[PDB]
Design a protein around this ligand. Sequence first.
Ligand code: HEM
Length: 154
Amino acid sequence: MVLSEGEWQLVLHVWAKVEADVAGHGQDILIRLFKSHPETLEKFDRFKHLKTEAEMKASEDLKKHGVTVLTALGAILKKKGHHEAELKPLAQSHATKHKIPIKYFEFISEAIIHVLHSRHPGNFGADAQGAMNKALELFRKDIAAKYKELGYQG
Ligand code: HEM
């Protein structure tokens, strides 16, 4: 898939707002994911034990990981499709070390869109959401192809 420049522009414009509060967005997104798809919480031995949203909210380790997640994602989006080098070590650890099925990437994609829509509605209208969804689909399709190369797929 190929995004146009206009689409990239919509993505990076909303991402610029996210980067005003990286820690806050990372928390919201991960909490959104664990609530909506409790199965994903299970893959994190580090967080497996958190029982409620408040514990999640109060967890500094969780906030730290959300920063790490969003920094890695931001670096990928800013490459505007040219992200082969950034994707390789990420595919390898998620497929081989952490054992994450491809499906869970769609779940986090959903969470990201939910949170941007909630916090940035003036900069996340229908066209901007379509562009972000395209950017994340591009991402997931490239990660899936790497999974297959690496021996996992799924
Ligand atoms: C937007 C997609 C994602 C990005 C950019 C991302 C990025 C990262 C990064 C940068 C790390 C730390 C270094 C590494 O181990 O590679 C990490 C660790 C990890 N990721 Fe992801 N991740 C994503 C999605 C997911 C999903 C969907 C899951 C599970 C449902 C997941 C589970 C994990 C686990 C289990 C760790 C290790 C945490 C620890 O105990 O330190 N990742 N991720």
